[PDB]
Amino acid sequence: HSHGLFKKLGIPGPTPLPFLGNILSYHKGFCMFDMECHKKYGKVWGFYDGQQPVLAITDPDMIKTVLVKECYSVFTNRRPFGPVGFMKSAISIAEDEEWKRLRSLLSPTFTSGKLKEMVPIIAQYGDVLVRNLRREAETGKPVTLKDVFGAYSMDVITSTSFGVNIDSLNNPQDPFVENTKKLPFFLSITVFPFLIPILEVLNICVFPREVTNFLRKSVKRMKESRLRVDFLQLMIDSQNSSHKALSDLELVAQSIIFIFAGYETTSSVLSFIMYELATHPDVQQKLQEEIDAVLPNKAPPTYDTVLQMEYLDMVVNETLRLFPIAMRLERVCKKDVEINGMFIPKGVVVMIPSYALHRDPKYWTEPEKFLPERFSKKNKDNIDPYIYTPFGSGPRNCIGMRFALMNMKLALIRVLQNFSFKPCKETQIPLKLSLGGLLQPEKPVVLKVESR
Amino acid sequence: HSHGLFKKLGIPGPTPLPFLGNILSYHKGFCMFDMECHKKYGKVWGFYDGQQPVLAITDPDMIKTVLVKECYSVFTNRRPFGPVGFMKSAISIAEDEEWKRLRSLLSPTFTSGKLKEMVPIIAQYGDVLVRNLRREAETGKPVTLKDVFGAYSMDVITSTSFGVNIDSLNNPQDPFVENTKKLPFFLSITVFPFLIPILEVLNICVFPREVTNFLRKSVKRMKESRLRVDFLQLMIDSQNSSHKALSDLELVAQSIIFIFAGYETTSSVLSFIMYELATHPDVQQKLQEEIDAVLPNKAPPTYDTVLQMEYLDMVVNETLRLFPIAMRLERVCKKDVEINGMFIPKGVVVMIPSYALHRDPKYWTEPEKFLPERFSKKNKDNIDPYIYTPFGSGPRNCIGMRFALMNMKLALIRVLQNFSFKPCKETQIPLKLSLGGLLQPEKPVVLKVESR
Amino acid sequence: HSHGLFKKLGIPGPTPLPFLGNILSYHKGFCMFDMECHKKYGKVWGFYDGQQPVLAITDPDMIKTVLVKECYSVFTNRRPFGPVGFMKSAISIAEDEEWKRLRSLLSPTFTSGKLKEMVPIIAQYGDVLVRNLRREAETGKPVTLKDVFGAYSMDVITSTSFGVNIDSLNNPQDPFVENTKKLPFFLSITVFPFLIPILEVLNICVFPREVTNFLRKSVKRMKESRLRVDFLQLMIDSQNSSHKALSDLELVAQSIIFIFAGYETTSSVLSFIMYELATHPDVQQKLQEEIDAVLPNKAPPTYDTVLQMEYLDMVVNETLRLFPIAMRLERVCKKDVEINGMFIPKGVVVMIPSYALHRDPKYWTEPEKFLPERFSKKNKDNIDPYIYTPFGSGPRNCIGMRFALMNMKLALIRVLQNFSFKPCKETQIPLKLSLGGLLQPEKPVVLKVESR
Amino acid sequence: HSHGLFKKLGIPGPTPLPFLGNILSYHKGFCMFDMECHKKYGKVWGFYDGQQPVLAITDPDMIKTVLVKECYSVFTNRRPFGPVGFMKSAISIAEDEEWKRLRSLLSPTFTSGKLKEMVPIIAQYGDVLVRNLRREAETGKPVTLKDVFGAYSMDVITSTSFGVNIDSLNNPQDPFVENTKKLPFFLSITVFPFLIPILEVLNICVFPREVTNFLRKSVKRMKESRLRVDFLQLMIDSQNSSHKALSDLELVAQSIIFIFAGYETTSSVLSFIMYELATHPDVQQKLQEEIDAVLPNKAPPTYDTVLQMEYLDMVVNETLRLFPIAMRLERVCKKDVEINGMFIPKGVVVMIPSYALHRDPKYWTEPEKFLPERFSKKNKDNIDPYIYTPFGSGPRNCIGMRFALMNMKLALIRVLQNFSFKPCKETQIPLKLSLGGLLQPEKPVVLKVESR
Ligand code: HEM
Ligand code: HEM
Numbered sequence A, B, C, D: 001h002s003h004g005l006f007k008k009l010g011i012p013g014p015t016p017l018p019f020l021g022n023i024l025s026y027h028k029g030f031c032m033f034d035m036e037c038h039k040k041y042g043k044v045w046g047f048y049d050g051q052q053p054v055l056a057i058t059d060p061d062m063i064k065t066v067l068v069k070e071c072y073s074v075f076t077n078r079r080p081f082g083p084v085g086f087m088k089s090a091i092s093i094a095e096d097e098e099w100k101r102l103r104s105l106l107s108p109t110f111t112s113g114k115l116k117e118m119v120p121i122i123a124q125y126g127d128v129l130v131r132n133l134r135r136e137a138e139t140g141k142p143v144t145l146k147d148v149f150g151a152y153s154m155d156v157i158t159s160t161s162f163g164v165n166i167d168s169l170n171n172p173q174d175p176f177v178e179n180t181k182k183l184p185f186f187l188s189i190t191v192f193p194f195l196i197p198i199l200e201v202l203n204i205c206v207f208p209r210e211v212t213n214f215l216r217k218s219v220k221r222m223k224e225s226r227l228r229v230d231f232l233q234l235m236i237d238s239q240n241s242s243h244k245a246l247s248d249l250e251l252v253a254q255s256i257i258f259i260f261a262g263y264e265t266t267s268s269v270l271s272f273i274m275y276e277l278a279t280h281p282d283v284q285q286k287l288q289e290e291i292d293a294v295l296p297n298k299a300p301p302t303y304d305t306v307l308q309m310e311y312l313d314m315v316v317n318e319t320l321r322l323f324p325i326a327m328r329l330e331r332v333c334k335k336d337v338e339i340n341g342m343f344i345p346k347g348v349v350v351m352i353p354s355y356a357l358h359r360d361p362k363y364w365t366e367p368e369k370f371l372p373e374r375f376s377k378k379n380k381d382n383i384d385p386y387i388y389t390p391f392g393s394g395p396r397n398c399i400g401m402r403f404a405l406m407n408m409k410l411a412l413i414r415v416l417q418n419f420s421f422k423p424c425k426e427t428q429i430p431l432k433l434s435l436g437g438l439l440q441p442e443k444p445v446v447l448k449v450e451s452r
């Protein structure tokens, strides 16, 4: 039915099949579908996730209007997601005023002030990171990074999102690790969205119950044992209250949505970085020299000395341009609206193809090359903040951005203070993106790790 | 799941069964369930249509807040209804700004000015009403009113909602009558609301297609033949334009929702009136004398002489108190709100039990008796407009109220100018309400019709 | 998922899309899809109605095995159909032993003995047929046949399937006609077969209730008024009893399934015949001369004189080859089986493309031409009864075949005894088949009717 | 709808609620619902799982007819179960001829001949059982049996169902243990059975994919490494072939269904036994003396010496009467049939309430007491094999019964050769059954373990 919408508005796009819409075209991945539509149709285009019209926009004014100017009034929420259960109280999933409240209640937790108090927690698990790596480096065996890096990203989440301290790699049998390790079906979510409500009254939760049952009680253990500078405690202090306080269940739901947002992003960006540092050894040396300058004698990184490292920042940012691991941003259009000369009707999903804008030859020279100088203070100013959006933009951007950048930077400083990384015969050169759902390598990153 | 809500808020009500909620209790009808809960639980109570929490309110302040003060801000829409298809553009079904627009676009059509121009159309089909009745009165055979009255209510709808002129009783084979006569499943709508969206992508429309296909083309015939003072023409003139104009499809959807709202209401109220006039012959005589006074020599009623008839008005109103044929009013609570001292959480349905307030001994003496003096100018002032609500109240009340009152009044004046109505041995005394869905008699009204 | 089946077996066919299978290819109609697959892939091919594998077979041995030899053992039922409700007791819909019983209980009703007793009923409504036609022939106005023919097919069904006698064209307001005239959504039945069971527990019946409620009571009126040689009475006599008797509800369900099978088939074949007789006037004259020979002085047809008419038989049969209005036959494969050298796995639907075999140049010379001599006693023997199957074949073939042939033949004899039929400027020459579901003309048949 | 069935047949039972049927009555558990209906309604009764009629039968003749005489003809399959995916090829889930084949293909694997070859595998993991227990016995800490016993039941399954050898308690990090440890929602399966097919086309498998993906490949590793006397190898030898061979996928599906059937049954019976041996210390001593007699000097048990132990057999059997952990047996009635004087219509589920027959005072004196002498050779003969059915009866009974009895007996001999078991203050005396789904203790069994 609703497949006639874009034709009437005169918006171009690929013709949709009945029921499926355009979803068959996701067979080369979201990344390649988006690049092709940018190429074929120019500045705007429309496709259909099943019956759901999606309008893609690439003009930086329009993007600003949607992400900033008309965020509260028109473009407040992302695509409706389910079946969720009580996770409807997670900030990323909540809508309209419930989100606005949740955002207000959680924002003091992610300030640079609070982030400086967490850096000694984040630091200690970098030590754990190196001593897991040195065990594989002294054994002359090429390293699968996602395992040592995956363990780091999960380690930092426990101790910051619940206060629990695990060497998940070597304390694998902690009751905590096993439950938090319970991190395809979502294509049917789309040809058959009418089925989400079925599952909701069936208590078929996308977040399994035993885990959510554990953390609820496990936080209700810690809440009633203190009664530490982790997200848990910063949230327990906020509900010691303007809007209402954060109910016990809501504080759990936020913790869980942090784990999810933080775990595989941090792991994948870190792997993407080390792949680039190994295939661009010059960039690696220059970074190691900066780390040794700011931190002589392999001094431990601190909040302030991290923010001192400009090339490290340049490497991280250039990597997040190549691999914006969320790939897209979305907002549901909640009202009939006109923006920067374009009528947009109610219920359309508006989408910003980050990946494709990050690799748009119209804004970047040699967009496939890993050139960190792009982000040099001399050249950084000629970058558009609505073209480069690895963490989104506007009131609903990534609230954990500052933390995620410190966290990865702390990982890298220490791992580069100790090791060098070289391609193995088993390294996938060139790295190929997973034609599948999330932004991750086809083949995992394997490299030789030697000890300075 | 959501069956714990009212307990937490400390709102009383009948305990719900899983999945079903309280729906098993509708076995004696909505009317008796509501009276019992008013009796058992006082001024507010909560029940569950399956999983859907419904909060009943009976304080006239609170009712005013919900229906008037916080209508636009909080309580704007009725229970979500489907699967509807294109009838999503009908004003009664549209929500929020789309409704606000539609209401603005249609309101000039229902003014007392426009109503006076339609009274000669409505009048001519009263003539048809009498000559169908005189045929059954000259044949010494007790009359089933819903047939002669049903034919009247449908007759007035055609000529006012599309311009077509049919003696539906004696021109039964008109292509128009057969399609418009395509006026249980809605209990499953409620234990299984998750199934509405299934039907929507299945084009399973609650309003069958051929009819809606006919009127679309049939209005697109009349629109392109004129290019008359019916609702159709008053709507064709409005789209000759503040909001946007009323799209061709939208004008059809309004016409259809008028037929629906107008047909069985007008038929049932008229039957309820004649049942009361026959079991209260004094009231009938006194009305016939008023009709003969204002209209000597059986003069034809006009707009102004109808508004002159105060007892006729008193009869109609007293009847609509006994039989408020919509029974309830509803608004979905769109925000967490507090009203007249009571927190009401988002997504609750708020409900005003009209029938039960209309028969609440706390506001009416002998509420079961048919006493039209209740509405005497002497006594009319001591009536609360939020207790007596046969047409609702506030910005979303019955937009066709003035028309519906003229229409029934025009029916009655003429039918009483000519006939008297007496109970037959087959009359159901006392009339019993249909324990089933809509407000209508168990047994249809049969009476003896004699000719003055 | 199940889209890999035919590849493994090495059966050719069009590649299916996910979820949809091959259904997009029905856009030129079942008839053209089948002819193309016969052309492209030879003697067997496979396609998918959504996830449902369908195997097409065209070898007359194989067809015999499926329709006859292994009917009871393997290929007993047609595609599961719903949501049906109590019509699960109709013989066409019942499965396995319940069907075998029903077939036994109903078979004496369709004998040539019983058919001769019904011919005077069928005859009288042919008279009604002519006098509806003569009214349009004396008015110099081209005739839409499906209206006069549709009225005939429905007339004969009432009086034979319930005993009721209506000139439906001129007694349109009979309570009986209106309910029996309550004779697209079935494509979703197939991409979403998982939804039939939903509707079943929702009492969403494909046969609406009021009709089925009427006939149940209306037969329970006639059953309790007699307690006539119609199907109703022949069924009331059978339940006056080997298997069990035919429950009251079952007798209704059979009556309804007869109406359905008999109404639009008889109407459409009759229209196809008259279209061919008008575009082949030679064939019409030769038939009129045979009718006048056997029946001199426009003598009324009888059972025996109908069976005397060999060219009339030749015309009817040749027409049913051109337009086999069921188009296909189907059986679900209930066991893993091998037949005439071919493994066929459980749950596959096996399909005989009648239309396409009826127009297969490999068995018919000039298959598009209307050549009734094909069925001449000289040439009739060289016809394969598993290639020509307008009524199916084997234990589950059309049980009402003998009746349907008499019925149409009786229509034609009388209408040709009185009128000649000539193409009008508004006749669609050449007739185009409806690219839509059932086998019927794109445009309805309009012709000039003159009076001998 | 179908809630009228038992009334018509004159079968008594609890009146069902719409949609839910009788399921609300499962709130005290299946065990108590069944005992109450046996008490209230006598020898047969009917209830409804939602719309699904279930007929309970308790006459031992009738039970024999259903389980034996008419197994192949009428009562072949259990309740249809889903959504399953490829596990449709598991023998317990397969139906009719596909089951009959699978049963034939797997039956040589469960002979007493093959069982004697596996006893040295089963034995070695009893050693592992004791040395896990001795660690908790030397630490003066009451033992949670389900952990040490759960680890035993899973240990024996790996090495016999795939050949893999793990001390799951102390090798917890084996890639094999973690995947095999991926062993509520099924009440909705029943009010909404119409939803199983939805999930099937959604690939929503009740057996998660990664596990089933692992074992498929992991067996395809072992199959292609040998190419040992485990079930895997005995099945690899069978497909080296009457029916067809066991496809690669089918052999996996059987292995998985063995794990499921074998894991929690063996763990729970073993816990039930040790609870009874600790609350009946006399029975424990008498068993320990028999074990020491047959096996002097704590000799290791063998196949033959296990079958020598008559009291050990008496203890096990008496326990399985108290706690028949499947609780019920079921067969779908596939045909209208009459059995031992009782019409049973097609599609009814027929159910044998094992638990309730095992505790029926009409067949057992003091049925709540743990009296192993019931099974003494003197008294064993007066036991009805259709009243006592811990493993079912007839062609579809528990195919792994002989193995399950050896397995538990081997556990017990060794654990009693070494330890004595005494109630702790934390022991739940009397043990209460879990009012929830499967037959297991409310509270897990904790006891003091001392070392002989
Ligand atoms: C390198 C790591 C990460 C990347 C690349 C990333 C990316 C993103 C993006 C692109 C968005 C959507 C922005 C928008 O819609 O405009 C987002 C949202 C969000 N992220 Fe991050 N993210 C990362 C790590 C984290 C971490 C560590 C947290 C820890 C708390 C976090 C918490 C959130 C939340 C709560 C939201 C939704 C905010 C809202 O809905 O108001 N993310 N992330
Ligand atoms: C005696 C006859 C009638 C009665 C007792 C009646 C009663 C009602 C009631 C109780 C409501 C809801 C009010 C609320 O929610 O506050 C309503 C709404 C409505 N009625 Fe009437 N009605 C009658 C006839 C008519 C007629 C003749 C029309 C012709 C146009 C009509 C058009 C509508 C519409 C469009 C609405 C919804 C308005 C909106 O959603 O904004 N009704 N009616």
Ligand code: HEM
Pocket: C091, C092, C093, C103, C257, C258, C261, C262, C263, C265, C266, C269, C324, C325, C326, C329, C330, C389, C390, C391, C392, C393, C394, C395, C396, C397, C398, C399, C400, C401, C403, C404, C405
């Ligand atoms: C010219 C008119 C008709 C045509 C072309 C036609 C065609 C067919 C065909 C092709 C089948 C399926 C045969 C098979 O699957 O092998 C069938 C089945 C059937 N027909 Fe006819 N039909 C006609 C009229 C009628 C009439 C008048 C009746 C009146 C009783 C009737 C009753 C049935 C029944 C009950 C079945 C299913 C039999 C069973 O399932 O055992 N049909 N028809």
Ligand code: HEM
Pocket: D091, D092, D093, D103, D257, D258, D261, D262, D263, D265, D266, D269, D324, D325, D326, D329, D330, D389, D390, D391, D392, D393, D394, D395, D396, D397, D398, D399, D400, D401, D403, D404, D405
């Ligand atoms: C003490 C342990 C066990 C108990 C109490 C138990 C009980 C049962 C029962 C009551 C049945 C249904 C019988 C019927 O419907 O008549 C059954 C079926 C079955 N069991 Fe066991 N079981 C146990 C262990 C095992 C084990 C260790 C296996 C290992 C292979 C196994 C394999 C099966 C299979 C395949 C079926 C279904 C047979 C078929 O459908 O043909 N079970 N079990």
Ligand SMILES: CC[C@]1(C)C[C@@H](OC(=O)CSc2n[nH]c(N)n2)[C@]2(C)[C@H](C)CC[C@]3(CCC(=O)[C@H]32)[C@@H](C)[C@@H]1O
Pocket: A081, A092, A093, A183, A257, A260, A261, A262, A264, A265, A326, A328, A438
């Ligand atoms: C769970 C949170 C949501 C709904 C999906 C996310 O998180 C994941 O994708 C986790 S993927 C995984 N599952 N299991 C394992 N090991 N990894 C995304 C994609 C990502 C973190 C970036 C943030 C954001 C919003 C914009 C997005 O695009 C998503 C969050 C906040 C979303 O609200």
Ligand SMILES: CC[C@]1(C)C[C@@H](OC(=O)CSc2n[nH]c(N)n2)[C@]2(C)[C@H](C)CC[C@]3(CCC(=O)[C@H]32)[C@@H](C)[C@@H]1O
Pocket: C081, C092, C093, C183, C257, C260, C261, C262, C264, C265, C326, C328, C438
């Ligand atoms: C209702 C009966 C069924 C299920 C469909 C039929 O009947 C129709 O198609 C009626 S179509 C219609 N609907 N409304 C109006 N006015 N016409 C078919 C197609 C046809 C009669 C030939 C017989 C058979 C079996 C083989 C078929 O192919 C069908 C019957 C017996 C089927 O069991």
